[PDB]
C-alpha cells in the first residue's frame, strides 16, 4: 500500500436548472468578462459561499472571545491582501455583503485590460495564453491569476515575447524569407 492522496471538488451546480431570471445574469457576466462556460461562474460562487459561512458563525460567539480574534483578523487580513475588501471596511460584518464580481475584477484577464495592454477583454485571454505577459519575472499563462495588491504594479510584457522584446515570430520571419530573398528574383 501507501498513503492516499487527498483531493476536493471545486464547484457546485444549482438546484433548479431551467429558470430564466437566473440564466441571464450568468450570461451578462460571460460576455462582460469573457468566460468559457458557466462552470467558471459556479467556481466563484462556491469559494464565496464558504467564506460567507466561515464568518457566519464567528459572529455568533461573543466578542473578546479568543477564537473570534485569531480566526477573524486572519480572514480579514487575507481578503485585503488580495484586494477585495476595501481598506476602510475592515470589520467582520462587512464581508457578509461581499459580491461575486469583487473577485472577478482581480483576475489577470481583467487586470491587464484595465492597465492598458489589450484593446479588448478578448485580447487579454489570448495574450495570456500565448505566453506574452510576465508579472515579476515569471511568464504566467492562466487567465485566473487573482493578482495580489502590492504586485499590480509589476505587470508588463515578457523579455522573450516579440511584442515587448526580441525576435519576431515565424510569420514575419517567414515573410522576410518570402520577400527579401525574392527581391532579386
Amino acid at each position: 500500500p501507501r498513503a492516499p492522496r487527498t483531493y476536493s471538488k471545486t464547484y457546485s451546480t444549482p438546484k433548479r436548472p431551467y429558470e430564466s431570471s437566473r440564466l441571464d445574469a450568468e450570461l451578462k457576466l460571460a460576455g462582460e468578462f469573457g468566460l468559457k462556460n458557466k462552470k467558471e461562474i459556479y467556481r466563484i460562487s462556491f469559494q464565496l459561499s464558504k467564506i460567507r459561512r466561515a464568518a457566519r458563525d464567528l459572529l455568533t460567539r461573543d466578542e473578546k472571545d479568543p477564537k473570534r480574534l485569531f480566526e477573524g483578523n486572519a480572514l480579514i487580513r487575507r481578503l485585503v491582501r488580495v484586494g477585495v475588501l476595501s481598506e476602510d471596511k475592515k470589520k467582520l460584518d462587512y464581508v457578509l455583503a461581499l459580491k461575486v464580481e469583487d473577485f472577478l475584477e482581480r483576475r489577470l484577464q481583467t487586470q491587464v485590460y484595465k492597465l492598458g495592454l489589450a484593446k479588448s477583454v478578448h485580447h487579454a485571454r489570448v495574450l495570456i495564453t500565448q505566453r506574452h505577459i510576465a508579472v515579476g519575472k515569471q511568464i504566467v499563462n492562466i487567465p485566473s491569476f487573482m493578482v495580489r495588491l502590492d504586485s499590480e504594479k509589476h505587470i508588463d510584457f515578457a523579455p522573450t515575447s516579440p511584442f515587448g522584446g526580441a525576435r519576431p515570430g515565424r510569420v514575419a520571419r517567414r515573410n522576410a524569407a518570402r520577400k527579401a530573398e525574392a527581391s532579386g528574383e
Binding site: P1, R2, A3, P66, L69, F70
Partner: protein
Amino acid sequence: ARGPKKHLKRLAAPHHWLLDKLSGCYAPRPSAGPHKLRESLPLIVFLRNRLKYALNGREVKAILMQRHVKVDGKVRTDTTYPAGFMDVITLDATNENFRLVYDVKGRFAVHRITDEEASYKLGKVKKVQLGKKGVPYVVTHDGRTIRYPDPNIKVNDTVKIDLASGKITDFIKFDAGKLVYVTGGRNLGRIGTIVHKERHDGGFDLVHIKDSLDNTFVTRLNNVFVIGEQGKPYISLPKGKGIKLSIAEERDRRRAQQGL
C-alpha cells in the same frame, strides 16, 4: 501473529519525528534497547532529518562504520539504536557535543553544549531494591543499575551520573518548590515548580506546578522529572526555557521580530 513484529508502517510512526507522508511506505523501527519505543528517536532520524548531514540510508551506515558517533562515551553502530531522553551524542571529527532534551511544542530539540557539561548525565529513580547477597541497587529511567547507594535516596528522586566510570556524585530529593521538567503528556516540555502533590491510595497521583509567569497546571506523578532547586538547574536549557506562549502572543512576536 505468532512471534514479534518487525516492520513499522509509515502512518503508524510516532508523530513528533515528522516523517513526511509520501517518501516511502515504512518507517524506521527502533531496536530494543534502553528507552521505550514511542519515547525515543533512532540514530537515523537524528543524522539525516535534523542535522542534514546524510542524504540516504546508505550514507548513514557509511558514517557509523567509521566509528565516529558515540553515545555516553561508548561507540554505537546500530543504525536504529534508540537514543532517548537526556542522552549525550558526541561526534568527534567536528568537536560537537549534543544533548537530547525537549522542545516546547513537543519535539526533540537540537542542542549544542560545551565540552565540560558532556561529562555527566542526570537520571531519575524508578525503583530501589535489595538484591542478591544483601546488597542494594537503584534503577534509573534509562535502565542503569547501580549498586551501593546512599540510604537517603528514595524513589522518584534524581541522581547525577558520571559517564566516565558510571558512578554517582550527588542527588536531589523530591518535595515542594523544586525545578521540574515535564517529560510526557500534554504539557510536555514545560518547566515550572512544585506547589504541592496530593495522593490517592491505589491510583495515579497528581502534582500541581506553577510556572515562572505564575500560571498553573496539573499532571500525573510519573511525567515529572526533577532538575534542580529554584532558579538553578543542573543542565543547559533551550531557548524559551519551557514557557508556554499563547498563539496570539506568538504571531505578533513573530511580526515585530520580522525586521530581519
